[PDB]
Amino acid sequence: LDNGLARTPTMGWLHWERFMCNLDCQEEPDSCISEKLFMEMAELMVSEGWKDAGYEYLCIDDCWMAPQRDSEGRLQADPQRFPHGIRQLANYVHSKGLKLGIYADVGNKTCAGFPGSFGYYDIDAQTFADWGVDLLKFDGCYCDSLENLADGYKHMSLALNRTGRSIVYSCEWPLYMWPFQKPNYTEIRQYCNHWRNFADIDDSWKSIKSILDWTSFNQERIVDVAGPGGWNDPDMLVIGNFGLSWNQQVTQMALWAIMAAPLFMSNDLRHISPQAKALLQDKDVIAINQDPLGKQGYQLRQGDNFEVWERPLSGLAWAVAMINRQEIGGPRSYTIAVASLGKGVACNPACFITQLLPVKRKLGFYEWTSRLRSHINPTGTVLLQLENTMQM
Amino acid sequence: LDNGLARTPTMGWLHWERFMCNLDCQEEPDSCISEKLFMEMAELMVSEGWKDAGYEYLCIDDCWMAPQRDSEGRLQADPQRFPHGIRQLANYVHSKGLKLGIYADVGNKTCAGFPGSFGYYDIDAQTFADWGVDLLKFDGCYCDSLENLADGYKHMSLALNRTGRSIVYSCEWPLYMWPFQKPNYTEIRQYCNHWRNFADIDDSWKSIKSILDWTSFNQERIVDVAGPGGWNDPDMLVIGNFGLSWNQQVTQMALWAIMAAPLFMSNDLRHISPQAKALLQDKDVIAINQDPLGKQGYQLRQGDNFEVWERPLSGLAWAVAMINRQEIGGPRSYTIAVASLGKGVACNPACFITQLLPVKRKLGFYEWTSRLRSHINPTGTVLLQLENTM
Numbered sequence: 094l095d096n097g098l099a100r101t102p103t104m105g106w107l108h109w110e111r112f113m114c115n116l117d118c119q120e121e122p123d124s125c126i127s128e129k130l131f132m133e134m135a136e137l138m139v140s141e142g143w144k145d146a147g148y149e150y151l152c153i154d155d156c157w158m159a160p161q162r163d164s165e166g167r168l169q170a171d172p173q174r175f176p177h178g179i180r181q182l183a184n185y186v187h188s189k190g191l192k193l194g195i196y197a198d199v200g201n202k203t204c205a206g207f208p209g210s211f212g213y214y215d216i217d218a219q220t221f222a223d224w225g226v227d228l229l230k231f232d233g234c235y236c237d238s239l240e241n242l243a244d245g246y247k248h249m250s251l252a253l254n255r256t257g258r259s260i261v262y263s264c265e266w267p268l269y270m271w272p273f274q275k276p277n278y279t280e281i282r283q284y285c286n287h288w289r290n291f292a293d294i295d296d297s298w299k300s301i302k303s304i305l306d307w308t309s310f311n312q313e314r315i316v317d318v319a320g321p322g323g324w325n326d327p328d329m330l331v332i333g334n335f336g337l338s339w340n341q342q343v344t345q346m347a348l349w350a351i352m353a354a355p356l357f358m359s360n361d362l363r364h365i366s367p368q369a370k371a372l373l374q375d376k377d378v379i380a381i382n383q384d385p386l387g388k389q390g391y392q393l394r395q396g397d398n399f400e401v402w403e404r405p406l407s408g409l410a411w412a413v414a415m416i417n418r419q420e421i422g423g424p425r426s427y428t429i430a431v432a433s434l435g436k437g438v439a440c441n442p443a444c445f446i447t448q449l450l451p452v453k454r455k456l457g458f459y460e461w462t463s464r465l466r467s468h469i470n471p472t473g474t475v476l477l478q479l480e481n482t483m484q485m
Numbered sequence: 486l487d488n489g490l491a492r493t494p495t496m497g498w499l500h501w502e503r504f505m506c507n508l509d510c511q512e513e514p515d516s517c518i519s520e521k522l523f524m525e526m527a528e529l530m531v532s533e534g535w536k537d538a539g540y541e542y543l544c545i546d547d548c549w550m551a552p553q554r555d556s557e558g559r560l561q562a563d564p565q566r567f568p569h570g571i572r573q574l575a576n577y578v579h580s581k582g583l584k585l586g587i588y589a590d591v592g593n594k595t596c597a598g599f600p601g602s603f604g605y606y607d608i609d610a611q612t613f614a615d616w617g618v619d620l621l622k623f624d625g626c627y628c629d630s631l632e633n634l635a636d637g638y639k640h641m642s643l644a645l646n647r648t649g650r651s652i653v654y655s656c657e658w659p660l661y662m663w664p665f666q667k668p669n670y671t672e673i674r675q676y677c678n679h680w681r682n683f684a685d686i687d688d689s690w691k692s693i694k695s696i697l698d699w700t701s702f703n704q705e706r707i708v709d710v711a712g713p714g715g716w717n718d719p720d721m722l723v724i725g726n727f728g729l730s731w732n733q734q735v736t737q738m739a740l741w742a743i744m745a746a747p748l749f750m751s752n753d754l755r756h757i758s759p760q761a762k763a764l765l766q767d768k769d770v771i772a773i774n775q776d777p778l779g780k781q782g783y784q785l786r787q788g789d790n791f792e793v794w795e796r797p798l799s800g801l802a803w804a805v806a807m808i809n810r811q812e813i814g815g816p817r818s819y820t821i822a823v824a825s826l827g828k829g830v831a832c833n834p835a836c837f838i839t840q841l842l843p844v845k846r847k848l849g850f851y852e853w854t855s856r857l858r859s860h861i862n863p864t865g866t867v868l869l870q871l872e873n874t875m
């Protein structure tokens with residue numbers, strides 16, 4: 094989408110995976126979808142270093158809405174959970190230096206059963222623009238055939254444009270297309286700043302594996318269409334929650350950087366370990382994700398429960414990820430000719446290799462003819478940065 | 486097995502899950518199956534508080550054997566990897582006040598392809614006894630019939646007894662039978678100090694869940710036969726490795742305690758987090774696992790992606806574990822009438838409840854009329870101890 098936005102993958106926080114559709118503010122107030130939750134998340138994004146690290150968008154997912162539209166046909170914030178309305182939350186979020194994302198659905202109802210945009214594409218787009226909304230996530234539930242899905246996604250895109258406000262547009266067009274026919278990524282890219290391809294993540298290693306395996310299986314179809322203004326969206330970062338071991342968390346961060354994924358944390362910023370925080374705020378891995386070249390990486394090799402992924406970076410640098418998919422035993426040795434990495438460019442005539450994950454370690458100069466030898470934890474990833482050099 | 490051993494479930498360390506069949510001492514001397522690995526783990530069991538917490542058996546699994554028996558038909562330690570031999574390793578382990586476990590297979594080979602014990606049960610038993618072995622784990626691979634399987638496990642049982650040496654006998658008889666016919670657990674217990682029921686654990690939450698699901702499904706057949714001298718073995722603790730989140734590690738420790746499971750760590754004691762160490766050394770939770778009554782706990786309830794398990798303890802105490810099996814979202818609220826716990830006796834007329842996991846916290850006095858409310862982490866467990874007020 095040529096709206097001048099998302100020149101790098103969008104970074105922020107989204108409530109869905111962690112907080113879901115919790116409407117019970119009486120018995121579950123700390124986890125219910127309320128203005129107070131977003132106000133508190135906003136403060137902590139500023140004070141706990143998240144905005145500094147690049148996480149800029151505070152995003153509302155499903156279950157912010159009143160059950161019905163107002164008399165004047167507009168969407169309304171839930172009066173009990175959002176009594177001060179979207180406009181004033183937008184003011185609060187802007188006052189902290191952050192941008193505000195909101196959520197709607199192309200079809201008749203949102204996935205959670207709240208008012209769809211089946212008509213109203215134009216008034217809804219305008220409502221968001223009046224409110225101060227800086228990002229829209231547009232889910233695809235309750236949609237009447239391919240024709241409407243496509244038409245709806247294309248309509249809301251132009252509608253947001255016609256508001257003349259800068260609004261990052263986040264689509265699930267491809268994901269809700271698969272059931273009928275293969276997506277057309279060139280068309281989707283025209284209309285959308287990023288697009289969900291695959292089933293909602295949850296707080297599990299199984300979910301990470303299934304997203305990586307779908308991505309690598311399908312990589313010839315999706316890798317090249319990604320670039321500034323249009324990204325593949327493999328769903329939210331779930332680091333800092335309950336389901337992933339330290340190693341599986343390193344794997345998600347490493348490979349979301351390889352895939353030029355948007356980085357939407359879905360966690361509780363009020364209750365997050367120092368380890369998870371340091372990983373999500375790792376300047377060097379964020380720098381790989383945010384690389385201005387904006388070329389998505391890919392899986393180079395698979396075999397013996399090992400995966401090798403790499404991503405081209407600006408200035409003849411490469412990121413390399415080595416995954417151990419063996420879920421038994423100890424750290425496994427993996428060796429590769431440095432020549433085989435970065436299409437033989439990265440280390441011609443030399444590489445300087447820095448390990449970034451699981452810890453940051455200068456490894457030194459590798460000749461084009463060198464071997465790289467590493468040890469990789471089960472369900473973990475080693476992430477390397479290769480800097481092309483004349484020296485040595 | 487009435488040999489006076491395993492009166493509480495056996496505690497220690499077993500190489501298999503973390504170190505497996507690593508024979509590469511040239512390229513990997515610090516993780517190959519060698520007497521140096523076992524000596525290192527022994528020193529740390531003493532120096533790092535493992536022994537003091539009750540971890541007492543340092544156990545060798547598969548891949549310790551030379552490829553061939555000796556000229557006298559006996560098993561031999563690999564001459565390169567176990568150069569001083571098993572007896573001498575046993576001497577060392579004993580000098581630190583620990584016990585040594587070793588491994589054999591009821592069939593013609595071990596699962597990894599080394600010499601099997603079929604036809605050598607009596608000599609193999611005497612060999613182990615002579616060496617000063619304090620425990621045998623007896624795997625079930627390369628056994629052509631259920632007759633040979635049963636005969637082999639019983640025969641080794643009687644041969645161990647006849648050596649005169651106190652040797653804990655860990656069997657896999659039910660595991661290898663189950664595909665073909667329902668095991669008789671009354672018979673297995675007469676011959677075995679503990680018995681593997683289910684597929685080898687690995688370093689995953691999938692493995693944990695599948696072991697718990699198998700145990701809850703089969704609980705009518707296995708819970709009542711467990712007790713001092715004979716335990717269900719749901720396989721090794723993998724806490725301190727790579728594959729489990731903190732909440733999944735808590736779930737393993739909590740439910741191995743509810744299940745009166747043997748506690749065999751398979752980890753690297755040289756490289757283990759403070760968190761993993763304090764969970765595995767948690768004295769209140771080990772006291773539940775090690776309760777002298779020896780009554781295995783069971784699944785009370787399952788619904789809304791929650792499980793409630795409980796175990797009766799010495800002195801009118803109960804352990805209760807509440808699992809959140811929902812792998813999405815945040816800490817979920819669960820409430821149960823305390824009258825529904827411990828068969829109606831735990832909290833009649835009242836009980837004092839202490840949370841043990843994920844943190845120790847006194848919750849206070851609960852009346853027979855009361856409801857316990859808890860928030861449980863996705864893939865996590867809340868473990869409570871109930872003390873009846875009388």
Ligand SMILES: *[C@@H]1O[C@H](CO)[C@@H](O[C@@H]2O[C@H](CO)[C@@H](O[C@@H]3O[C@H](CO)[C@@H](O)[C@H](O[C@H]4O[C@H](CO)[C@@H](O)[C@H](O)[C@@H]4O)[C@@H]3O)[C@H](O)[C@H]2NC(C)=O)[C@H](O)[C@H]1NC(C)=O
Binds near residue numbers: 095097255258259260
């Ligand atoms: C509604 O849709 C229209 C139709 O596309 C859209 O207009 C386009 O906006 C983009 C973004 O501003 C324009 O692209 C820019 O063009 C100008 C002029 O050539 C350049 O200054 C811009 O350069 C930036 O990006 C460069 C990297 O590519 C940087 O090097 C540089 O520093 C600049 O930051 C950029 O190329 C595009 O020209 C228009 N196209 C048309 C047909 O007008 C409009 O923005 C949409 N409006 C909203 C609010 O959605």
Ligand SMILES: *[C@@H]1O[C@H](CO)[C@@H](O[C@@H]2O[C@H](CO)[C@@H](O[C@@H]3O[C@H](CO)[C@@H](O)[C@H](O)[C@@H]3O)[C@H](O)[C@H]2NC(C)=O)[C@H](O)[C@H]1NC(C)=O
Binds near residue numbers: 487489651
């Ligand atoms: C070989 O098999 C026999 C028979 O099963 C085992 O005998 C049993 O041994 C236990 C433990 O020594 C006896 O019970 C215990 O006795 C001791 C001392 O008297 C007491 O302190 C305990 O409280 C408990 O009562 C058990 O009764 C006995 N059974 C029989 C029939 O004699 C023997 O231990 C086995 N030997 C080896 C080397 O495994």
Ligand SMILES: *[C@@H]1O[C@H](CO)[C@@H](O[C@@H]2O[C@H](CO)[C@@H](O[C@@H]3O[C@H](CO)[C@@H](O)[C@H](O)[C@@H]3O)[C@H](O)[C@H]2NC(C)=O)[C@H](O)[C@H]1NC(C)=O
Binds near residue numbers: 591592627630633634
């Ligand atoms: C370990 O290996 C030996 C040798 O391969 C096994 O011994 C063999 O066991 C088979 C049973 O599977 C015997 O075959 C039987 O032969 C009779 C007729 O003789 C036939 O009627 C049966 O139906 C069956 O086919 C075979 O005779 C026997 N061979 C020897 C040398 O004893 C042994 O059983 C293996 N042990 C285990 C536990 O797997």
Ligand SMILES: *[C@@H]1O[C@H](CO)[C@@H](O[C@@H]2O[C@H](CO)[C@@H](O)[C@H](O)[C@H]2NC(C)=O)[C@H](O)[C@H]1NC(C)=O
Binds near residue numbers: 277278279280
């Ligand atoms: C997939 O979508 C792309 C973009 O809509 C299609 O390519 C364009 O099709 C339009 C309308 O037919 C042409 O006017 C353009 O010249 C085409 N290219 C571009 C880059 O805009 C493409 O035909 C669609 N279908 C397939 C099978 O690729």
Ligand SMILES: *[C@@H]1O[C@H](CO)[C@@H](O[C@@H]2O[C@H](CO)[C@@H](O)[C@H](O)[C@H]2NC(C)=O)[C@H](O)[C@H]1NC(C)=O
Binds near residue numbers: 669670671672675
């Ligand atoms: C399961 O195995 C047990 C023990 O081998 C069997 O129980 C024995 O039954 C015999 C009768 O054949 C009695 O002599 C013994 O007193 C019992 N032993 C014990 C300690 O109970 C039982 O028969 C087997 N059950 C089935 C269903 O086959």
Ligand SMILES: *[C@@H]1O[C@H](CO)[C@@H](O)[C@H](O)[C@H]1NC(C)=O
Binds near residue numbers: 236
């Ligand atoms: C919404 O429902 C109406 C019928 O009430 C139907 O005509 C329309 O196709 C539906 N719209 C979408 C986008 O599914």
Ligand SMILES: *[C@]12O[C@H]1[C@H](CO)[C@H](O)[C@H](O)[C@H]2O
Binds near residue numbers: 233265293
């Ligand atoms: C749409 O299953 C829905 C849900 C909201 O109800 C989330 O937004 C999810 O990410 C999306 O795929």
Ligand SMILES: *[C@]12O[C@H]1[C@H](CO)[C@H](O)[C@H](O)[C@H]2O
Binds near residue numbers: 547
């Ligand atoms: C038998 O798969 C084997 C293996 C040794 O080779 C381990 O001892 C495992 O625990 C056991 O079931």
